[PDB]
Structures are given as C-alpha cells and as structure tokens.
C-alpha cells in the first residue's frame, strides 16, 4: 500500500492518492493499487459511498512518463481505458475531491467519479497536443466541457479554473481549498443515508442515458483516434 | 371538470392545475382531466400556443400516493406506463408550442408536468427536486434529469434529494427565464402572445427540428430505458415490504 | 475571388467576408467562393489554423434572397442541399483548427458560416438570431441550434425570433470568448497564433476526437434529419403562394 | 363495424379487414375503426394475442385516394401524421403479441397495417410492394423498408416499384413463415394459440426487449426522419401540379 | 489450481476451453461460470494463444443456468448477482481481443446462449437445437439480449413468444451460426478453422475484431444490452411479487 | 482520360473501369478520374441513373500497391474514404455491375452504389488481415454481411461467391456473366423512367435510416481503427503494411 491509502468509516470508503512527492503522477503500480482500492470498496457491503481524494498541493500531474504500436495499444487499453470505465460503472456513488493541478491523465481519475468537488484554486488541463496526441485516452472532454471548450483547451493546452469547469457542469461544487475535504465528506455522508439499491439505480438511470446517447461507443472511438497519435509519433521518431 | 380549468382566448389555451388544497398533488382523475385538456388544445385550430400553470403557492407536490387483491409489479408497470410515461410523452409531442409557468415547489412527479412543455418560466421562489431515492426508486418515471440538468447535477440531486432554486436550473438551461413571482403570469402570457403571432406550421416544424434532434441523440430510447430502471425500484421495494415504495 | 479575401501568413489562413455594403448577405457566388477558400486553406501547407472574419459592422445578415419557369421544391432542395448543407458540413470537417470572429449582427444564414468553425470569438456588441419562422420555415437549413444553445433556448429563439447577446450565447458555450469590438481581430489572431505552434497531426486528431464524439452522439444524422424538416417549410410556403418563403 | 370485424375467443382478438369490394383499400373510416379495434384488444384483459387478417383475395391494395379550398402541405402533413404515422406506431407498441396473416397483394399503405404486427405469416401467393415512387413519393409514410428488407432490397423495390413474393420476403426475415393459402388462417390461429398460453407480463417484456433494442438502434428516430422525407414528396408534387401525388 | 468443471488446453496457439459437466448437460452454476471466466482470462493473457475455442463434453452444449444452484430474497440481490456472472462475464468474453469460436452440439438452451454468443464465430453440429423458453418462467428472454442482433426482431419475438427450438440450419440462415457441420466432425472442423486463423498477425486479428464489434457498439449494442438487462429484471421483480421466488 | 470511360445515353451515365491489363487495380490517377466521372454524372441533369461497370475479367483487384502515419492518414482519408462517401451520397440511383474478382479496395468502388448486380462468377474478399490491417478503409463489411460473416472473412481472408453475398443482401441479383451488362442496363432503364425527385428521396429514406442507425459514425470510427494498423505496421518495419 505504498501509493494509495484506504480507509472505511461511517459507510464511506476514502481512497487517497498518496504520492505527493511526484504530484501524484501515475505509474503502473499506482494505477494497479488504485484499481484494487476501487474493487475493495465496490465489494464491501459496509461501504455505501466512495470518496477519491489526494494528498498534497496537487490532485494529479498525470501519467508518469518515466517498441510497437500493438504494445502501447494493449497497455493503454488496460490501465487507462478499461480501469477508468470499470470505476465509472461501480454500482455505488463516488465523489472526487480535486485541489490544485489536475493535468491530462489526472482527468482519468476524477471523470469516472459521479460527482466532482473542486477547490477554488484547482486548475484543469490536458496539454497532450504538445506531445502529438489528440487528448488523453478516455475522452470525457466533449461530454464534460462541451465541444467548443474541449477543442479550445486541447488546441491551446491552457488550464481552466474551477469556476470555469463548474460553469460547464464538470464540477458540481466549488469551495475554498480549506473546505474541500469538509464539503466532500459532508456530501458523502448525506448520500450514505440513502438506500443502496436506489443509489445504484439512480446512478444507472443517468449512466444508461449517457450510454444511449453514445458515451460507451464514443469513448471507444476516441481511444482509436488517440492511438493514431502514438502511431504517428513513432513514425516520426 | 373539478381539478383542471381550461380557457381559450387570444389563440392561447391556458390549462390550470386547480387542486391547491393538496398542493396540486396528482391523482389519476387529475391526470386524466389534464390529458383531456392537452388533447382539446391540440385539436383546436383556434389555439396556437398552450400555457400550463397552477393555482396556489406551489406548482405541484407530485404524485398523490393516497389516490388490488394481490398487488403485482405487472399492475404498477401497466398503470405507470399509461398515466406517467405515455401521457408525458404525448404532451411533449403535441405539435404546438407549450410553456409551463412554475411557482413554488415542483417535486418529483411535478416534473412530469413541466418537462414535456417546450419552454419553462419560473418564479424566483421556485424550488425543483426529485427526492424519490428515499422511497427506493432511481428518480421519477420520465427521466428528463440528465437531459435537463446534465448528468453530474442529475446524480447529485437524485443521490441527495436536495432542491434546486430557479436560478440554479436556469443555469443548466432547464428554465428559460426567471421572473419575480408577481410577474409570472403576465410574463408567461406576454411570451405566449408573441409566439401566437407566428405561422402555425413553422412553429410546428421548429418544435419538430429540436425534438427530432433530441430523438436522434437518443431521447425516446433513453426515456424508455430508464422507465424499466425505475420499475426495478418498484420491484425491489415490493420484494422487501410488499409495497411499491419503501 | 470577388466577395471573399484570402490571406496566408504566420501559419494562419484568414478568410474575410468582404460584402459590408450588403451587411455580408450571402448570395450563391459568395458561398461558392467561400467554399473554394476553405478548400484552399485545407490544402495549403503554409496553413495550420483558419480564421473566418468579416468586414464592416456586421458579420452576416444571412442569405441574400434578392440573390426556372416552373419553380419546384425539387429545385430549392437541390440548391440548398449543396450551398447550405453540404458546404457547411464540409467546412465543419476541414482537418485544421478554425476560428470565427463575429461582430454585430449574425442572423439566420450567418450561423451557417460561424457554427462550422471550431471556436467562436464574439464582440461584446454581437447579436445572434434566427427569425426565419416569420417566413414559414422551422429554423435555418443546418440545425446547430439544439447542439449549440440547448433545446429550450433553441425553441425559445425560433418561436420568438428574438436576438441573443454575446454574453447570452457565451453562457451556452456557443461562443468561446467575448471581447470588446475594437479587440476582436487582435484577440482572434493571438489565439490562432497560439494554436499554430502545435503539431498539425495532433491538432487534426484533437479536432477529430471532439467531432467524432459529436457524430456518435448523432450530429451528422440529426443535421440530415432537420434539413428535411426545413424543406417541408419550403414545401408549405410553395403550396400557399408558389414562392419558397412567406412574403 | 362497417369495415372491420372483431372477435375474441381463446384469449385471441382477431381483427379482420372486411372491405373486399375495394380490395381492402383504406379510407379514413376504415382506419378509424381499425385503430379502435387495436385499442379494444390492447385494453381487454381477456386478450393475450392479436391477429390481424383480411377477407377476400387481397390483404390490402393500400390507401384509398378516392376517400379544402386551398390545399396546403400543412394539411396533408397533419392528417398523415395522425392516421398513417401515429396509428401505425401505436399498433407497433401495443404491449401484447400481434400476428398479421397476409394473402394476395399487400401494396404501399398495406405495409402500414402488417409491419406494426410482431410476426407475419404469408400465403404462398402473397405479393408485397411499394410503387409510390410513381406518384413522386420516396416510399410510404412509415419507413419499415430498410429494417424489414435491408437497404439494398428496399432501394431496389422503391426504385423499380416491383413486387416481391412471399418466399423473397421470408428470406429477409420480414415474413416469419410461408404457408399455402388454404392453410393461412389455420397456421396463424395455431401459432396464436401457442403464444396465448404464456404469462402476459413475460410476453409484454419479451416484446419490449426486442422493440427497445430496435429503438436504441434508432427505429423511432428513423421512422420520424423518413416521415419528413416522405412529406417533401408531397411538397414537390404540389409545387408541380397543385396535388399531393403525381 | 483446482479444476472442477472446465478443462483447459493450450497447443498450436489455440486455447481450447471445454465445459466438462456433462452429467448435468453443462448446466451452469456460479462456480462453473467463475471457472469459465478464469479460463477466458487465462487465454486472453497468454501470449502463446492466438485463438480461443469454446466447446463442451457430452451430448449437449448447455442446458442453461442451474436452477438448483438469503433469509429474505430481494430483487437487489438477484440484480447484483446476475449483473456480475451473467451480464458482465458475457460482455467481458465478447471483448477479449483475440478471435474466439464456439463449437455447439445438441441443446443450447437459454443461458447456454450466454456462452456461445460472446464468441466471434459459431460452428454448429447438424443436430444442434437453440432455444430460449424463459417466457414460461415469466421472464422476457435471458439476461444478455443477443436475440435481436443474432436472429433479427421477427425471429427473436417468434422464438421468445413460443419457446420453440431452432435447428442449426435455421440459425445458419440468420447468420447466427457461421457453418453447420456433421456432429462427428464438429471438433475437427472447429480446430481446423482455429488453426487457419492462428496463422494471422495478432494485432490485425484484434483490429478486425474491433472493427466489427465497434460498428455494433455504434449501432447501439452495448446500450441495448444494458437496456434489456433491466427489462429482464422487471420479470424477476414481477415473479417475486406474484410468488416470492424470482421465476414462476 | 486514361483509365475511366464515360458514356451518357437514354438518361444513363455508364462509368467504366478501363484498366483491364491490371485487373482494374486502383492507383491515385484512376481514383481521381473515377471521382470526376461520378461528379460529372451527378451534375448532368439529363442523367437519371448511374451504372458502374468494369472491362476485362475482374471488377477490381483493389488498391495498386505500386513516410509518416500523418501522410498515409491524409491520403487515405481523401481518395479512399471521402471519395467513397461522396459517391454513396450522389442524389441519383447508382448500380454496380460486378464480374469476376472484387478484392479489398474493389469493395470501396461497389459498396457506395445503391444496387449491386453480380455475375455468377463473381468472388468477393478482403484479405488485408495478412498485411496487418483490420479490413479496408470503408467498413461496409458488418452492414453488408452481418458481423459473424464479416469476422469470418476478415479473420480467414477467404472469398465469398456471388450466391453467398446475395444471401446476406449485399448483392441484389446474380446473373450469368454474359448477361451482366444487359441485365444491368435493363434495370437502369426501368429506374430511369421514374420521377427524379422521388428516386432521390427514396434513396434518402434508406440512406438516412442507415445514418440514424449509425452508418456515418461507424464508418468514421473504423477508419481510425484501420489507421492503427498502418501505425503498427510502420512501427514494426517502417512501411504501412
Ligand atoms: Zn496514450
Ligand atoms: Zn413509479
Ligand atoms: Zn431554405
Ligand atoms: Zn403521404
Ligand atoms: Zn435472470
Ligand atoms: Zn489503408
């Protein structure tokens, strides 16, 4: 349990990213620990609500950078795409608490949560166009931001403030940094009073509407677009 | 015609919920009168625009749960498919513009009355909620939530049962305009009057352009999918207690 | 190139609507030239980003109708399907970032010029509308309204024909940024210049990611569906008066 | 009961088209009686299965064109949207199994009667066609063609106006079974009888499983889209001749 | 590892997964399904495997879910367990990024379809009989609604409404079965086909499979499967409201 | 013109693939000429129906085989995907007459036609899996053949007879080789009697149903999957296949 802390109390499972020395950059080991924590929470009948949070100044700087396309495709399809979709589908409510920087692969950790609470000084970005890739592997951008904002931030690599993403509906609530854990836990507690099958089916109502709208199919389509970026990058260098 | 009043003047059909003594709680009889009113307005060539409004402090407290031998899910499923789902979809598709005027509380089944309207004008005091998760059900029968609020707000308000102010739902696009409560009726009628000057077939097809876009996006199919999700909640409640809600 | 000016420098193709004396009303000749300019930009290896802008006070007043012995719906359908629908979709899909700079009035057909652009920057003074219901038609030929405004706002502005301010459309996400009118061109070019530092294939695939998400959501199919709904408007106007619109 | 006969026995509602003097061509009166018969069967708890059949040599020769000072597309659109599109979708969605027994010719509008049924049994002699391109229209109002035939056969039969045999439409899956003409009623009745033994809620939800799969695939949205395409045909015919069909 | 119900062999780049509960006509209890899921995972993760073959010992491919296999039984409980071992398992097998082939002999009833439909290709013995008679038990078809996609809607409704069986030749006509072969050659024909496919480059196979499966998901496959799962569960909900047990 | 012949008579535009010495293998010049021919037919108000046919033994052996992924992507998106979709959408009926072998890229020529008439001898295949690619650029396979048959023929590279593809609905009619041109022209002639706007909208009714079902979006999705095959082939060897 190096990289990920796990606590259960009052029917809330709190999963903490604990690699602040690297701004919670994600290596394969961290991702495997994180996927195990989600599974543990999903399987525990004493857990009603999942809280995903991070220690330190920044939620996550993204994937830790430190050969065939088939190899990249296979690895990214598991740890990036399959993991994030599995988290998305866990049949209990989940809430991310985001402070400071949430960059590129960071979005693959919070987007799968049902609700997001952000500190006022949180900054969200996906500057991977600079590295020759058309946005990260799990394309929540268009769904979360709308297409024009998604294009703007992909084309420029600029950051968005917490208030800006709250306006698009990607962030549910913006609170001062000193209230982020308070607000997240209070909301988790309110939700934890509710019947678990009703929570499950409320979640399913919304997620199935998104899937009818094309969410699953679109996420799969964009994964292949992303991979053409890797294929081009390899062909150049 | 106890529960629903109906007026036609100046090419506007005004349908009024008139059960203020129960905060416009909806029993089968009210819903049948309401559907007949919508049909009357739809079929009247002297009506260009439909206004739906409510008497009293509150638009609607929702379904009236005080309105057989061995109760089965088949029975609940059949009845709710007719008076909740089919009725609300039928209103949604009436080929003339419709405007809901919403004051005070609009709770759970109240949403099945205003969401089918094309436009919603809300009083500053309006409070929208769907707290049915408390009763073991994953939101009301007609799932406009994700479409009207976006998925994250939809989940938030279903998971918590909290209310949203008129200003909050205006931000999502669910409400077109927010006005002081003393101006709700006048602003709604003024807007209806502006729209009533337009060519009826253009109004019909403008409405169709937007609604068919939504159907291509998956609206019809999603509404049908979530109805079955809703009904699994009744099924579970019955398996726990013998009753369709906890 | 009578009505459209084309300039390339700094990795930017600037395409300018140059009919200010008619408030950039669009006749078929202007549209043919505009389509040629988009195609030229798409093929130009000196070009990373496209900027669409307009001379004068107004971005575009819409389609020029001042602009066949037995007139038929078949004829209207065929021409509108090419210069309105096919052109706008082709611009939409050009595999390079595009930015519309919109000042003053952008009415009805005007929207067919800016909606296909990836990003829209509007002057504080910009006013967007689609009042064609007055002419017996259910919104313009390319139905961006629902996608850009949300369904309730789309219905409201079609049913009433009212205008929306730059601020109003920025709240729906249809406009990316609102800036003072005297900064519109500078701000647009600065943003284009930022984007033009990026690798072209990454820009193309970022654009694709978003536009393909939209097509999976139903964008292409919905645009085609609404085109026919629009054409039933022309069909009705013709059945009433023998003319494509109510006059 | 001028045009439509109706019988309920062994939990089967049999709806019979009874206008052989016009080869079961459909005037508004016949369609109104037919819709009433479907509603009656839908609402009757003693009915588990619906059978639609026809008297005489032909299932239906289609819409009766022999059954307003300034005729407008608005008027045509409004009427066709009700008795053609809305009626057929309503029958499609009745929450009980339905079976069409089709003999002889089923032409154009005839398809609006059998396609909404869940299952089709055809006589060996049956001929299916939609030659409405001759009248300047892109196929009938309710576009099952692509769904039932596949897109290439749909285009071929629309573009040529040719008829398809029972065998040919059985190969596409549009017809479930082909039997000799003198066995059509007996085979249909036996099939209905087999289905009528099953629990009604399971029948309802098996039907929903398939029909909701179709709506997620785009059926409802596609049907609505093609109705507008159809109407552009009327709009063009009126622009050429002042009449809805060439 | 403990092996109980599933035989597993890897040779010549083919993983052959065998249902080995012929004493129960390969009726599927939760343990069998867990073991079968593990076998699919083993094959998926083995770089020496290019193709997966699913087959069954004895006369019958699978009689379906084992009926004889909590103080207060609730729909939540049934929903949770079926969502895992029926729906999630079958979707996971569907998505394994290597070609898979089912060899189907004799009866393949109801839950049996959840084992073969996830395979890419189906080879059936001339004697194979496919059915889903669960309407008799008050349920609108099994949990993973392949029926409409595999059979077309009219055939799907016919066989659900009647509970009748379809011959191998009948399902081959809809495209659900790729090839019908004599019973005594089913294993040889299947392995020969697996061998031919196992000569191809693995990434090209993966992306050919993806091309088709992603086309199906754009068409609505994932969303429709999820939708019908809830329809199926309303059947259980109703059966419990009538009798207290999840099937009539 | 070098590779494509074009004739208009009796309201039929006949477009002929005329590179028989190469079994109508498709180089970029041939494809540009083909696209020009489709455009000419589409724009000619005296043409009601388009017939696409081929000289020699074979309809088309596919793309003529005789560097970055960006370059391959750009070129294939134009001449293969954009061209084929443009042809698919021409607002007039079109009919392909397919004799002999139609392999891989050959499918990009006939699938965009509304109707396909095949000689009894015709053989259809897509063996590109052998070259490390997940089927050709325009993924009609699932739509035309169904998913199981599409997977089988992609995974094996086997050919399908005219009778087999007729059973799936991909071929409208199968006729003897010596009657292919006559049967196609007679069918075109029947269709050319019909009102052009009704033909247009009949075509639209079916094609829009397909696009509501997901056809446009799916074709775009699979194009990217195809390009990951080129991406991988280049990462192994340096060439696209
Ligand atoms: Zn990556
Ligand atoms: Zn309910
Ligand atoms: Zn127009
Ligand atoms: Zn008609
Ligand atoms: Zn079950
Ligand atoms: Zn290629």
Question: Tokens standing for E152?
Answer: 């077309």
Q: How far apart are CA F61 and CA F72, in angstroms?
A: 20
Nearest to D72 among C77, C218, C236 (CB): C236
Asked whether E34 and E5 are in contact (CB, 8 A), the reply is no
Asked whether E203 and D170 are in contact (CB, 8 A), the reply is no
Nearest to C229 among D71, D73, D228 (CB): D228
Q: How far apart are CA F38 and CA F13, in angstroms?
A: 9
Chain F hits for A234, Cβ within 8 Å:
69, 231, 234-235
C95 inside 8 A of chain F by CB: yes
Question: Tokens standing for F191?
Answer: 């269709």
Asked whether A95 and A60 are in contact (CB, 8 A), the reply is no
Give the closest residue to B187 by CA, choosing from B171, B175, B202.
B175
Handedness of CA B18, B23, B29, B33 (dihedral sign): positive
Chain D hits for E162, Cβ within 8 Å:
191, 194-195
By CB atoms closer than 10 A (0-12, 13-18, 19+), residue D96 is buried
Q: Which helix (H) or strand (E) holds F13?
A: strand F12-17
Residue holding tokens 């979708």?
A: D89
Q: How far apart are CA B111 and CA C120, in angstroms?
A: 34
Q: Is B243 helix (H, G, I), strand (E, B) or coil?
A: coil
F27 inside 8 A of chain C by CB: no
What spacing in Å lies between the alpha carbon of D118 and ligand 6's midpoint? 43
D168 inside 8 A of chain F by CB: no
C235 inside 8 A of chain D by CB: yes
Chains that touch C (3 or more CB pairs under 8 A): A, B, D, F
Asked whether F75 and F95 are in contact (CB, 8 A), the reply is no
Contact: E156, D194; criterion CB under 8 Å = no
Asked whether C88 and C116 are in contact (CB, 8 A), the reply is yes
Asked whether A145 and A168 are in contact (CB, 8 A), the reply is yes
Asked whether C202 and A134 are in contact (CB, 8 A), the reply is yes
Ligand (nearest to CA of C62): 3
Q: Which helix (H) or strand (E) holds C54?
A: strand C49-54
Asked whether B139 and B147 are in contact (CB, 8 A), the reply is no
- Which residue is closest to D79 within chain B, CA to CA? B43
Q: How far apart are CA E118 and CA E149, in angstroms?
A: 12
Q: How far apart are CA C100 and CA C192, in angstroms?
A: 10
Neighbours of ion ligand 1 (CB under 5 A): A 76, 137
Residue A210 CA: distances (Å) to CA of A142, B116, E116, E231: 12, 20, 29, 18
Residue C212 CA: distances (Å) to CA of A76, B51, B226, F137: 20, 39, 26, 16
Q: How far apart are CA E195 and CA E188, in angstroms?
A: 10
Asked whether A232 and A88 are in contact (CB, 8 A), the reply is no
Nearest to D234 among C71, C72, C235 (CB): C235
Q: Count each helix (H run) and each strand (E run) in chain F, helices first.
A: 10, 9
> From the candidates E218, E225, E227, E231, which should be mutated to test the interface with A, based on the most A CB atoms within 10 A?
E218
Listed in sequence order, the residues at least 6 apart from A186 whose beta carbon sits closer than 8 Å to its beta carbon are: none
Give the closest residue to B143 by CA, choosing from B236, B215, B225, B245.
B225
Q: Is E239 helix (H, G, I), strand (E, B) or coil?
A: helix
Asked whether A119 and A162 are in contact (CB, 8 A), the reply is yes
Question: Tokens standing for D53?
Answer: 């059949």
- Which residue is closest to B137 within chain A, CA to CA? A198
What number of C-beta contacts closer than 8 Å exist between E and F? Answer: 102
Q: Find how far residue B214's CA is from the centre of its chain.
A: 17
Q: How far apart are CA D44 and CA D51, in angstroms?
A: 14
String of b and e for B60-74 (b: at least 16 CB within 10 Å)?
bbbbbeeeeeeebbb
Give the closest residue to D72 by CA, choosing from D242, D245, D233, D224.
D242
Chain D hits for B218, Cβ within 8 Å:
216, 221
Contact: A235, F236; criterion CB under 8 Å = no
Listed in sequence order, the residues at least 6 apart from D30 whose beta carbon sits closer than 8 Å to its beta carbon are: D2, D3, D4, D17, D19, D64
- Relative to beta strand A160-161, strand A115-119 is unpaired
Asked whether B108 and B63 are in contact (CB, 8 A), the reply is yes
Calculate how close chain E gets to F1, using CA atoms only, in Å.
36
Chain D hits for C238, Cβ within 8 Å:
73, 235, 238-239
Question: Tokens standing for B27?
Answer: 């029993």
Asked whether D111 and D128 are in contact (CB, 8 A), the reply is yes
Q: How far apart are CA A202 and CA B159, in angstroms?
A: 7
Instruction: Give the end-to-end CA distance of chain A in Å, rounded to a whole number.
Output: 37
Contact: E218, A216; criterion CB under 8 Å = no
Q: How far apart are CA D144 and CA D77, in angstroms?
A: 19
Residue holding tokens 């999963």?
A: A15
Calculate how close chain E gets to A42, using CA atoms only, in Å.
11
String of b and e for B15-45 (b: at least 16 CB within 10 Å)?
bbbbbeebbbbbbeebbebbbebbeebbeee
Q: Find how far residue B195's CA is from the centre of its chain.
A: 21
φ/ψ of residue B165, rounded to 5? -75, 165
CATH of the domain at A99: 3.90.226.10
Listed in sequence order, the residues at least 6 apart from A211 whose beta carbon sits closer than 8 Å to its beta carbon are: E222, E223, E226
Contact: E207, F134; criterion CB under 8 Å = yes
Contact: A68, F234; criterion CB under 8 Å = no
Longest pairwise C-alpha distance within chain A: 55
Give B129's strand partners. Answer: B107
Nearest to C159 among B171, B175, B206 (CB): B206
- Which residue is closest to A222 within chain E, CA to CA? E214
Contact: F67, A235; criterion CB under 8 Å = yes
Residues spanned by the domain of A33: 1-237
Chain E hits for F228, Cβ within 8 Å:
207
Q: How far apart are CA E211 and CA F231, in angstroms?
A: 15
F19 inside 8 A of chain D by CB: no
**What are the DSSP calls for E71-134, one per residue?**
-S--HHHHHHHHIIIIIIHHHHHHT-SS-EEEEE-SEEEGGGHHHHTTSSEEEEETT-EEE--G
Neighbours of ion ligand 5 (CB under 5 A): E 82
String of b and e for C84-122 (b: at least 16 CB within 10 Å)?
bbebbeebbbbbbbbbbbbbbbbbbbbbbbbbbbbbbbb
Give the closest residue to E152 by CA, choosing from D146, A223, F158.
D146
Residue C85 CA: distances (Å) to CA of C82, C88, D236, F114: 6, 5, 19, 22
Contact: D210, E153; criterion CB under 8 Å = yes
Calculate how close chain D gets to C177, using CA atoms only, in Å.
35
By CB atoms closer than 10 A (0-12, 13-18, 19+), residue A178 is exposed
Handedness of CA D205, D206, D211, D215 (dihedral sign): positive
Question: Could you count the other beta carbons within 10 Å of the beta carbon of residue E24?
Answer: 17
Q: Is F189 helix (H, G, I), strand (E, B) or coil?
A: helix
Number of domains in chain A: 1
Give F173's strand partners. Answer: F117
**What are the DSSP calls for C183-238, one per residue?**
GHHHHHHHHHHHHTTS-HHHHHHHHHHHHHHHHHHTHHHHHHHHHHHHHHHHHHHH
> From the candidates A197, A202, A230, A234, which should be mutated to test the interface with E, based on the most E CB atoms within 10 A?
A197
Nearest to C226 among B120, B202, B209 (CB): B209
Asked whether A172 and B197 are in contact (CB, 8 A), the reply is no
Q: How far apart are CA B195 and CA B162, in angstroms?
A: 34
Contact: C209, A134; criterion CB under 8 Å = yes
Contact: B220, D225; criterion CB under 8 Å = no
- How many alpha carbons lie under 13 Å from residue E113 in its C-beta half-sphere? 25
Q: How far apart are CA A146 and CA A143, in angstroms?
A: 6
Q: Find how far residue F65's CA is from the centre of its chain.
A: 18
Chain E hits for B231, Cβ within 8 Å:
230, 234, 237
What spacing in Å lies between the alpha carbon of A105 and ligand 4's midpoint? 54
Contact: F232, A67; criterion CB under 8 Å = no
F231 inside 8 A of chain A by CB: yes
Give the closest residue to A31 by CA, choosing from A82, A91, A73, A95.
A82
Q: Is B143 helix (H, G, I), strand (E, B) or coil?
A: coil
Ligand (nearest to CA of C141): 3
Residue holding tokens 């038929």?
A: C72
A194 inside 8 A of chain B by CB: yes
Q: How far apart are CA A232 and CA C198, in angstroms?
A: 15
Q: How far apart are CA C177 and CA A151, in angstroms?
A: 13
Ligand (nearest to CA of D109): 4
Q: How far apart are CA B126 and CA B105, in angstroms?
A: 6
Ligand (nearest to CA of A76): 1
Q: How far apart are CA F241 and CA F67, in angstroms?
A: 13
What spacing in Å lies between the alpha carbon of C230 and ligand 3's midpoint? 6
Q: What share of chain F is helix, strand, coil (3-state, %, to 5)?
A: 50, 15, 30
B174 inside 8 A of chain C by CB: yes
- Which residue is closest to C133 within chain B, CA to CA? B202
Give C63's strand partners. Answer: C26
Question: Tokens standing for A111?
Answer: 């987007």
- Relative to beta strand E107-109, strand E100-104 is unpaired
What spacing in Å lies between the alpha carbon of D79 and ligand 5's midpoint? 44
Q: How far apart are CA D17 and CA D23, in angstroms?
A: 10
3-state secondary structure chain A: CCCEEEEEECCEEEEEECCHHHCCCECHHHHHHHHHHHHHHHHCCCCCEEEEEECCCCCECCECCCCCHHHHHHHHHHHHHHHHHHHHHCCCCEEEEECCEEEHHHHHHHCCCCEEEEECCCEEECCHHHHCCCCCCCCCHHHHHCHHHHHHHHHHCCCEEHHHHHHHCCCCEEECHHHHHHHHHHHHHHHHCCCHHHHHHHHHHHHHHHHHHCHHHHHHHHHHHHHHHHHHHHHHC
B207 inside 8 A of chain C by CB: yes
Nearest to F209 among D146, D159, D230 (CB): D146
Experimental determination technique: X-ray
Longest pairwise C-alpha distance within chain B: 55
Asked whether D208 and D125 are in contact (CB, 8 A), the reply is no
B214 inside 8 A of chain D by CB: no
Longest pairwise C-alpha distance within chain F: 55
Contact: C216, F221; criterion CB under 8 Å = yes
Ligand (nearest to CA of B233): 2
**What are the DSSP calls for chain D, one per residue?**
--SEEEEEETTEEEEEE--GGGTT-B-HHHHHHHHHHHHHHHH-TT--EEEEEESSS-SB--B-TT---S--HHHHHHHHIIIIIIHHHHHHT-SS-EEEEE-SEEEGGGHHHHTTSSEEEEETT-EEE--GGGGT-SS-SS--HHHHH-HHHHHHHHHH---EEHHHHHHHTSSSEEE-GGGHHHHHHHHHHHHHTS-HHHHHHHHHHHHHHHHHHTHHHHHHHHHHHHHHHHHHHHHHHSSS--
By CB atoms closer than 10 A (0-12, 13-18, 19+), residue D9 is exposed
Ligand (nearest to CA of F73): 6
């Amino acid at each position: 349990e190096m990289y990920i802390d796990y606590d259960v109390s009052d029917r809330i499972a709190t999963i903490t990213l604990n690699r602040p020395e690297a701004a919670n950059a994600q290596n394969p080991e961290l991702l495997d620990e994180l996927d195990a924590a989600w599974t543990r929470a999903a399987e525990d009948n004493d857990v009603s609500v999942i809280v995903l949070r991070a220690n330190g100044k920044h939620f996550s700087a993204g994937h830790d950078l430190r050969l065939t396309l088939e190899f990249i495709y296979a690895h990214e399809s598991r740890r990036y795409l399959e993991y994030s979709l599995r988290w998305r589908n866990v049949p209990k409510p989940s809430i991310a608490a985001v402070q400071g920087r949430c960059i590129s692969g960071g979005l693959l950790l919070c987007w799968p949560c049902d609700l997001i609470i952000a500190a006022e000084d949180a900054l969200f970005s996906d500057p991977v166009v600079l590295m020759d890739i058309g946005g990260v592997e799990y394309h929540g951008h268009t769904w979360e931001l709308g297409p024009r904002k998604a294009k703007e931030i992909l084309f420029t690599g600029r950051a968005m403030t917490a208030e800006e993403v709250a306006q698009t509906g990607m962030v549910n609530r913006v609170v001062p940094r000193d209230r982020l854990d308070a607000e997240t836990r209070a909301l988790a507690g309110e939700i934890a009073k509710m019947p678990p099958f009703a929570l499950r089916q409320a979640k399913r109502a919304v997620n199935q509407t998104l899937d009818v709208q094309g969410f699953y199919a679109a996420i799969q389509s964009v994964f292949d677009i992303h991979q053409t970026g890797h294929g081009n990058a390899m062909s150049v260098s």
